[PDB]
Design a binder for this molecule. Structure first.
Ligand SMILES: [Mg+2]
Ligand SMILES: [Mg+2]
Ligand SMILES: [Mg+2]
Ligand SMILES: [Zn+2]
Ligand SMILES: [Zn+2]
Lengths: 174, 108, 177, 38, 162, 156, 42, 99, 39, 38
RNA sequence: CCUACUUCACAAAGCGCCUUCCCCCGUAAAUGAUAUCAUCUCAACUUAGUAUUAUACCCACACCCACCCAAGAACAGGGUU
């Protein structure tokens, strides 16, 4: 279909390769990130009315993985589709005029230079972190008499409330 | 004429007072549901297991219905089916299970 | 009758599906009847432990009517657990957001505050318009009558009634209105 | 606008109006006279 | 009645006032000794805001009100009728007595918030955010206090603040 | 005395016209005659009664048991006429007293079947911080009555 | 075209069977409303 | 102590249950509980809430007859309040005198 | 309850001063009257 | 407590409040409003 | 987030780099009755006037001894073609 003003097309799944320097014609330096499209295919397409009636959806798969370490239902799905299994599957909300047949490959030239994109990913996990690193809390002085209280959160609430509010910032997985 | 309550459901009520005036007599025969107010019983005869080769293949196919679900989806299914809440279907401890009367009294 | 005991018990304690209409009704007057028939307080066999509740299907809940200026004065209030989480909306805003929230909240308020309330609400079905699912429609019995009386605006007045109504005053002929 | 519990016209051009559920004294000749009920 | 019609023809505007038909009173009013039309027809305390058949005989073709010197109502019945007609206008009644406007109805506002017995103007009443204590609650005015003397058949008085 | 139709001109309830007294008297006479001939022919079966007894009203039928909470000064096996019948109903008809039905009309019989005591009832009194604690056990007398028959006579 | 008995049930088949049982009880005169046995002496 | 104090509550709660059941049955017949109770008293039929609920559950024909009688007495009371008797003061009126 | 009972002159509480209270509860089946009740 | 004379209206005993509520002035009400009749 | 710089070095960091999107109402104005002028309207009504009936994330029911991991206190999770 031709492109309409209020239309949205599919994205892709890439792999983060690294970062590189880049320079512009005015001499400015910008750091860039390289995203490689390893094996990106459209996996399945749900109709507008079959998910929420709000927008159509396209499922897209990431890089190929081994068939020996996947769920049997996933293996049956990929056998029916006729493609290698993918490490991740992400769902894109699209208009009905942008739907593509499942199994089609998606290439990097889907995006053109002079364009702004959104990149979603699982950030680096730092485990159970103290409040100082987790929330940028200032700690306590180092030598002026403090007793085992250099990185503690300090007070967590007031006395009148008699409890801790749900949104309180405390140490935890980060 | 005059009727205190409509005489089309459950009764045809007439109220009388005896000549002595000391006892009230209530006559109330039952009303039957008329034939014009009923609908015929449906007669479903679904027969779609007959394939042109065999006859006991459908007898084998009759035992093809089987399904298993875990606690979460099974409880959701039961709650949806019986219009109840999920808490009805979780189990109880041995204390409650064993302090329940298994031979309760019977009336009538 | 003579009603062998198991069929007799089943008939006595069977559930009934009632259909109730919105369409200019007061939400609280709808909720009163809905609460009565959700608790089972309309049956001479009622008891709290007998679980003798019935299904109430309220349609057209988007077209309810409020008396007075409750659309602008009635405030529904809630609180997310987090600080700064106090929320207060008017009945108009809540109705535009959700076309069943007002009647649902009224029925929830009128229902008894014990552990049976959530089951009684599970036996409640609300729809904002005339559309109802086919299974529920096949389940429906004995539609309840509307509590409000639809005050019958001017244009639907069967000109015979206009001729019946008298003219209270003769106006001047030299007036412009 | 000045908040008052009692409002009175301070000249002949002041007029009392009932707007947004409140009593206002509006003046076009002296805008000094603009009063709002509290 | 009377009307003004303006005919523009050849850079000449003819302004004419014509007399049209007019409805008279009914032949035998029940109480000819009364002073108001309401008193004459024994309607005192007998009408509500639903009685558009009675209200629309006192109102202009564009939903406005008529003065007492024309209608013949007393001061009390005039206020009762005017408040009842305000409530009828806010209740969606009187569809053909809409305010006149060239093209301003096309941008339709918020959909039909069905309402009745609307006392205040809907666009000028603030939400009750605090509701006060139990012994002094901020109640919600339903109906008009100028109808407190209407005939009551419920054995319980009408509730004006609820 | 004319008022134009409004929402308040006429009472909301429908206008009720009770029947004319003499024709209603004749109708009552014919209804009592029909019920009486049903009684004489025996067009009833398994009727019940409401009987005032021992400060209580009992919905009794034939063959059942009633437990009354005191002694009666009767031997076990004694047959007794239960007076004070205020309602007796069969299928298709019911007779009411004002407040009691006539002696000639109804006849309820009951036999004394068991004279016993109740299970122990505990009566404990306690008040905190007052050393106030008392305890009783009571067993009240009890009589069991089996209703044998409820007869009706044509004297209506 | 005349109703002789009625019966309830969870399914239409069991309701019909109960109605047949009720009809049999009425025809045979063994109902819950029948005249109770008369225990007396002649 | 709870066992001893629970007798009052048992009496009160059983009476409340009877009242609820009678209200349900009367609303099934279109009546209201106060109207039914008051006019049954006015007809000199002295049935208590217990037996009234018993009949509402187990003798629906009898309960419908009772509700019809109460409605008739209520209409007669309305007619009496309208006409001061004149003549017959109602038929299910005319209380029976005792000496 | 009954306040109309008082207007009929009939003991607003129906459990006193009337046949319902003062009449014998029972009698022997052969006809002999019962001994008087204690109340 | 308070003195018999105070500055804050000294809310009353509930029996006194009921007495004042029950002994209020009731103006006469004509059978027909004076304006209606000629 | 780690390509430069810096503490450092198969990492983690800042002193370094990258990204960051709707209103909110108090008044100011048209037509116009009650009160045939006029009147912004707790009169019916027309505007500035409503961001919301928001979109972004995330949403695969059972291979799993064992090994590795940018995943992790344990458990869990990702990979093993
Ligand atoms: Mg430091
Ligand atoms: Mg130390
Ligand atoms: Mg240290
Ligand atoms: Zn001025
Ligand atoms: Zn007058």
């Amino acid at each position: 279909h031709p492109w309409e003003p209020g239309s949205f097309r599919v994205g892709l799944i890439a792999l983060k390769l690294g970062m590189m320097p880049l320079w512009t014609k005015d001499g400015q330096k910008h750091v860039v990130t390289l995203l490689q499209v390893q094996d990106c295919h459209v996996l399945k397409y749900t109709s507008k009315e079959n998910c929420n009636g709000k927008m159509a959806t396209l499922s897209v798969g990431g890089k190929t993985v081994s068939r020996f370490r996947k769920a049997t239902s996933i293996l049956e799905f990929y056998r029916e589709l006729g493609l290698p299994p993918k490490q991740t599957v992400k769902i894109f909300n699209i208009t009905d005029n942008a739907a593509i047949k499942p199994g089609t490959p998606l290439y990097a030239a889907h995006f053109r230079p002079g364009q702004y994109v959104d990149v979603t990913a699982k950030t680096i996990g730092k485990g159970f972190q103290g409040v100082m690193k987790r929330w940028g809390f200032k700690g306590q002085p180092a030598t002026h008499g403090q007793t085992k209280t250099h990185r503690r959160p300090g007070a967590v609430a007031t006395g009148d409330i008699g409890r801790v509010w749900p949104g309180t910032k405390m140490p935890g997985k980060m | 004429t005059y009727s205190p309550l409509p005489d089309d459901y459950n009764c045809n009520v007439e109220l009388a007072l005896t000549s002595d005036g000391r006892t009230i007599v209530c006559y109330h025969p039952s009303v039957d549901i008329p034939y014009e107010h009923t609908k015929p019983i449906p007669r479903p005869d679904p027969v779609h297991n007959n394939e042109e080769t065999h006859d006991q293949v459908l007898k084998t196919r009759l035992e093809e219905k089987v399904e298993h679900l875990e606690e979460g989806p099974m409880i959701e299914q039961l709650s949806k089916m019986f219009f109840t809440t999920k808490h009805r279907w979780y189990p109880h401890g041995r204390y409650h299970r064993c302090r329940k009367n298994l031979n309760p009294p019977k009336d009538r | 009758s003579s009603f062998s005991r198991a069929p007799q018990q089943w008939a006595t304690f069977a559930r009934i599906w009632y259909l109730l209409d919105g369409k200019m009704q007061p939400p609280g007057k709808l909720a009163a009847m809905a609460s009565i028939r959700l608790q089972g307080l309309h049956k001479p066999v009622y008891h709290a432990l007998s679980d003798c509740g019935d299904h109430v299907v309220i349609m057209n809940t988007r077209h309810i009517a409020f008396s007075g200026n409750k659309w602008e004065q009635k405030v529904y209030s809630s609180h997310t657990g987090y600080p700064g989480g106090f929320r207060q909306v008017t009945a108009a805003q809540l109705h535009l957001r959700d076309p069943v929230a007002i009647v649902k909240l009224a029925i929830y308020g009128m229902l008894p505050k014990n552990l049976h309330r959530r089951t009684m609400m599970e036996r409640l079905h609300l729809f904002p318009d005339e559309y109802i699912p086919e299974d529920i429609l096949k389940n429906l019995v004995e539609e309840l009558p509307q509590p409000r009386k639809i005050p019958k605006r001017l244009d639907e007045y069967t000109q015979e009634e206009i001729d019946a109504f008298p003219r209270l005053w003769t106006p001047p002929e030299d007036y412009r209105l | 606008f000045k908040n008052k519990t009692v409002l009175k016209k301070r000249c002949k051009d002041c007029y009392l109006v009932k707007r947004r559920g409140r009593w206002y004294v509006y003046c076009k000749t002296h805008p000094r006279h603009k009063q709002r009920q509290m | 009645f009377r009307e003004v019609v303006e005919t523009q023809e050849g850079k000449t505007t003819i302004i004419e006032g014509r007399i049209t038909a007019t409805p008279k009173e009914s032949p035998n009013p029940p109480n000819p000794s009364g002073q108001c039309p309401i008193c004459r027809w024994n309607l005192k305390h007998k009408y509500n805001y639903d009685d558009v058949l009675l209200l629309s005989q006192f109102i202009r073709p564009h939903g406005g009100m008529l003065p007492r010197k024309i209608t013949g109502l007393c001061q009390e019945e005039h206020r009762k009728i005017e408040e009842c007609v305000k409530m009828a206008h806010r209740a969606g009644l009187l569809p053909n007595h809409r305010p006149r406007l060239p093209e301003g109805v096309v941008p339709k506002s918020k959909p039909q918030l069905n309402r009745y017995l609307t006392r205040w103007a809907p666009g000028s009443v603030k939400p009750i955010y605090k509701k006060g204590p139990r012994w002094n609650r901020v109640r919600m005015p339903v109906g008009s206090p100028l109808l407190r003397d209407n005939v009551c058949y419920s054995r319980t008085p009408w509730k004006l603040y609820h | 005395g004319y008022v134009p139709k409004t929402s308040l001109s006429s009472p909301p309830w429908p206008e009720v016209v009770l029947p004319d007294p003499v024709e209603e008297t004749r109708h009552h006479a014919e209804v009592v005659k029909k019920v009486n001939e049903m009684i004489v022919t025996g067009q009833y079966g398994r009727l019940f009664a409401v009987v005032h007894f021992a400060s209580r009203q009992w919905k009794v039928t034939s063959e059942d048991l009633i437990l009354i909470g005191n002694e009666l000064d009767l031997a076990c096996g004694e047959r007794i006429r239960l007076e004070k019948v205020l309602l007796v109903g069969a299928d298709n008809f019911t007779l009411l007293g004002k407040p009691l039905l006539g002696k000639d009309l109804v006849r309820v019989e009951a036999t004394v079947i068991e004279k016993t005591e109740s299970w122990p009832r505990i009566i404990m009194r306690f008040r905190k911080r007052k050393n106030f604690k008392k305890k009783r056990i009571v067993t009240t007398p009890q009589t069991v009555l089996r209703i044998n028959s409820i007869e009706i006579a044509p004297c209506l | 075209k005349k109703l002789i008995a009625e019966g309830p049930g969870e399914t239409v088949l069991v309701a019909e069977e109960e109605a047949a049982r009720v009809a049999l009880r009425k025809l045979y005169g063994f109902t819950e409303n029948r005249r109770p046995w008369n225990y007396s002496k002649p | 102590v709870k066992c001893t104090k629970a007798r009052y509550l048992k009496k009160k709660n059983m009476r409340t249950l009877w009242i609820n059941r009678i209200t349900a049955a009367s609303q099934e017949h279109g009546l209201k509980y106060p109207a039914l109770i008051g006019n049954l008293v006015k007809c000199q039929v002295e049935l208590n809430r217990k037996v009234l609920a018993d009949l509402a559950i187990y003798e629906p024909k009898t309960f419908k007859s009772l509700a019809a009688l109460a409605s008739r007495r209520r209409h007669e009371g309305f007619a009496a309040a309208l006409g001061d008797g004149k003549e017959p003061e109602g038929i299910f009126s005319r209380v029976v005198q005792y000496h | 309850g009954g306040q109309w009972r008082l207007q009929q002159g009939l003991a607003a509480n129906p459990s006193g001063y009337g046949p319902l209270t003062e009449l014998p509860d029972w009698s022997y089946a052969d006809g002999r009257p019962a001994p008087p009740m204690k109340g | 407590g308070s003195k018999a004379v105070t500055r804050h209206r000294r809310v009353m005993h509930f029996q006194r409040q009921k007495l004042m509520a029950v002994t209020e002035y009731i103006p006469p009400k004509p059978a027909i409003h004076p304006s209606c009749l000629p």
